[PDB]
RNA sequence: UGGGAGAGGGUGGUGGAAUUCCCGGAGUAGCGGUGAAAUGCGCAGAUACCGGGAGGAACGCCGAUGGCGAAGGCAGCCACCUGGUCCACCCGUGACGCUGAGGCGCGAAAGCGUGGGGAGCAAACCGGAUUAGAUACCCGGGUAGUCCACGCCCUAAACGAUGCGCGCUAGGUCUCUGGGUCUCCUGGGGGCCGAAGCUAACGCGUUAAGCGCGCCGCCUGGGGAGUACGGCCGCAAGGC
């Protein structure tokens, strides 16, 4: 299904190139530090590609995570 | 003997066996078990039942230190992972939380032939 | 039974107890179609469970049975080349079937010369908890479960 | 002239996950491996867990049914150096074009020199199994190699098995990139189905095997044979 609302849908006006806006980027990572796929982030090929570049930058700065622990299994 | 009360329970599932390590609130092992520690000597070690016992054994051994609650850390995929968990939830011990932490490389070392041909 | 699911034929109630479970046991006691001969053995044995016990046969019967019903057994299966004895439950219909059969089999294995005696004597040892009929049963169970390591092969 | 999208190339730097190794802690009998096993490893304390180091190699999710490049081929992130290409304007030259024998350059993997580096993997090899045998498939080890610099080699199912260029001949749908009077039009890519037509069929079908023109390269029954001989080329293996 995948319809708990698209990530972009909830956010407002954000700069996809702002690699310091952790509060927003945070929204695009799954329960794990994994970058969500388009079918979930609801971005466009062009946007999603830009986002990814940003998310990665953040991780280098320590702002975002490379990976997290699942809490079930 | 040292009394710990709360701690960690690391289930390490494999396709060949299932070992379990109960440690203190910060990783130091208290007791442990596995399909080997218990009877099974071979392929039997991998079976889910084996997993169950190993879980119980370690669980019991642990309570003989006061252990009343545990945080669970699962690692790996194996014909006997879920059973080890279910076994601990019933081992009297209180299962505070379950959490998978199976290691996965961010793509690095070339696996043995036994695991390639992938992609 | 490749097509439908086979309907368990219904037997004629007992002419002395109006019981179907009796006729069933009587049929198992039966040899080459001679039922009269069979029937006798049973009742004649019921009369022996009468003398040697204040309890009525019908009751001794039921209990004797009830004790020999296995509730678990191991059926085979092929996996990877090797064979495994998978422990699985035992349906009601089969429990009964194995019981009555086992009794008669254990009975005729007894040392006493007279048939009706063996059936009576086995039946008694049965309700008592002893007897080879029960031994066969407890054994099937020991066998089963004693392979719990393979139970994850739900039939 | 203004604007754009890219794993296109080269150099330096840098991040985190994982494997191995070493140190320490804590722990104790097994771990591993398979169809089942054994070789193997472990009381000189392994496996499992935590903390700290060292090192090499490759970049998870994003990642596509996607993009770029003339092919090979190209993905972590940052900077510098650098090629190609698309669109808008319709502003300059004024046929300055197309193809291209030979030549020159490029050219996956393996392989070859000299010097480095070697964590994981792994031809040969050393062993354990399986088997009638098992110079194998399965299991435990393991050298060259795989990585880097510089120089060679130049092959391939180097494939769309489809040489470039241009013009012409319904449309439908999805997608990546521009521009616009941003339902929808326009341009350049990537796919699918299909007009006409073509095809031995299979299929192809504005990304042609369609309709045409230009230029190159090839084919002419199978085996012998990509062999022999002769030439070039290569350190060699060998290549043409
Ligand atoms: K060498
Ligand atoms: K046709
Ligand atoms: Mg008769
Ligand atoms: Mg690039
Ligand atoms: Mg030894
Ligand atoms: Mg010792
Ligand atoms: Mg460490
Ligand atoms: Mg080293
Ligand atoms: Mg392209
Ligand atoms: Mg290719
Ligand atoms: Mg003009
Ligand atoms: Mg003029
Ligand atoms: Mg080459
Ligand atoms: Mg190479
Ligand atoms: Mg070399
Ligand atoms: Mg190896
Ligand atoms: Mg053979
Ligand atoms: Mg041999
Ligand atoms: Mg090997
Ligand atoms: Mg191809
Ligand atoms: Mg040509
Ligand atoms: Mg189309
Ligand atoms: Mg198009
Ligand atoms: Mg298009
Ligand atoms: Mg047609
Ligand atoms: Mg078509
Ligand atoms: Mg044409
Ligand atoms: Mg054709
Ligand atoms: Mg030729
Ligand atoms: Mg010929
Ligand atoms: Mg050749
Ligand atoms: Mg050759």
Compute the number of strand runs of chain B.
5
Specify the structural class of chain B.
alpha/beta
The CATH superfamily of chain A is known as Ribosomal protein S18
Q: What's the CATH H-level homologous superfamily of chain B?
A: Ribosomal protein S11/S14
GO biological process, one term (chain A): translation
Family (chain A): Belongs to the bacterial ribosomal protein bS18 family.
GO cellular component, one term (chain A): ribosome
GO molecular function (chain A): small ribosomal subunit rRNA binding; structural constituent of ribosome
Folded structure, characterized:
Chain B: Residues 99-119 are annotated as: Disordered. Chain B: Belongs to the universal ribosomal protein uS11 family. Chain B: Keywords: Ribonucleoprotein, Ribosomal protein, RNA-binding, rRNA-binding. Chain B: Part of the 30S ribosomal subunit. Interacts with proteins S7 and S18. Binds to the C-terminus of IF-3; however exactly how IF-3 interacts with the 30S subunit is unclear. May contact the C-terminus of Era. The structure is cut from a larger assembly and holds chains A (73 residues), B (119 residues) and C (155 residues). Chain A has 73 residues and is mostly helical. Helix content of chain A is 40%, strand content 0%. Chain A is built from 4 helices and no strands. The two termini of chain A are 21 Å apart. The longest helix of chain B has 16 residues, at 48-63. Chain B is built from 2 helices and 5 strands; from the N terminus they run βββαβαβ. By secondary structure, chain B is of the alpha/beta class. Chain B has one domain (1-119): 2-Layer Sandwich (Nucleotidyltransferase, domain 5), CATH 3.30.420.80. The relative contact order of chain B is 0.22. Helix content of chain B is 21%, strand content 28%. In chain B, strands 3-2-1-4-5 form a 5-stranded mixed beta sheet, covered by helices on one side. Chain C is mostly helical and 155 residues long. Chain C has one domain: Ribosomal Protein S7 (Orthogonal Bundle). In chain C, 52% of the residues lie in helices and 8% in strands. Chain C has a two-stranded antiparallel ribbon with strand order 1-4. Chain C has a two-stranded antiparallel ribbon with strand order 2-3. Chains in contact: A-B, B-C. The site of one magnesium ion has 4 residues of chain C, from helix 2. Chain B binds one RNA strand of 240 nucleotides through strand 1, strand 2 and strand 3.
């Amino acid at each position: 299904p995948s319809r708990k609302a698209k990530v972009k849908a909830t956010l407002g006006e954000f700069d996809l190139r702002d690699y310091r806006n952790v509060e927003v980027l945070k929204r695009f990572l799954s329960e794990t530090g994994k970058i969500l796929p388009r079918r979930r982030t609801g971005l466009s090929g062009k946007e999603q590609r830009i986002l990814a570049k940003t998310i990665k930058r953040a991780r280098i700065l320590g702002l975002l995570p490379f990976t997290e622990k699942l809490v079930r299994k | 003997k040292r009394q710990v009360a709360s701690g960690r329970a690391y289930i390490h599932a494999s396709y060949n066996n299932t070992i379990v390590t109960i440690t203190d609130p910060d990783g130091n092992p208290i007791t442990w078990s596995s399909g080997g520690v218990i009877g099974y000597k071979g392929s039997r070690k991998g079976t889910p039942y084996a997993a169950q016992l190993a879980a119980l054994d370690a669980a019991k051994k642990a309570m003989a230190y006061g252990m009343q609650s545990v945080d669970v850390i699962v690692r790996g995929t194996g014909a006997g992972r879920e059973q080890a968990i279910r076994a601990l939830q019933a081992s009297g011990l209180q299962v505070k939380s379950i959490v998978d932490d199976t290691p996965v490389p961010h793509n690095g070392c070339r696996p043995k032939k036994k695991f390639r041909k992938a992609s | 039974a490749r097509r439908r699911r086979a309907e368990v034929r219904q037997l004629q109630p007992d002419l002395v107890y109006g019981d179907v479970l009796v006729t069933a046991f009587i049929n198992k006691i039966m040899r080459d179609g001679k039922k009269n001969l069979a029937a006798r053995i049973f009742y004649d044995a019921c009369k022996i469970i009468q003398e040697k016990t204040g309890q009525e046969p019908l009751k001794v019967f039921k209990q004797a049975v009830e004790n020999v019903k296995p509730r678990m057994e191991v059926r085979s299966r092929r996996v990877g080349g090797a064979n495994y004895q998978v422990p699985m439950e035992v349906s009601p219909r089969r429990q009964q079937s194995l019981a009555l059969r086992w009794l008669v089999q254990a009975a005729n294995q007894r040392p006493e010369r007279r048939a009706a005696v063996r059936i009576a004597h086995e039946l008694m040892d049965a309700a008592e908890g002893k007897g080879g009929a029960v031994k066969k049963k407890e054994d099937v169970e020991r066998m089963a479960e004693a392979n719990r390591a393979y139970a994850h092969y739900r039939w």
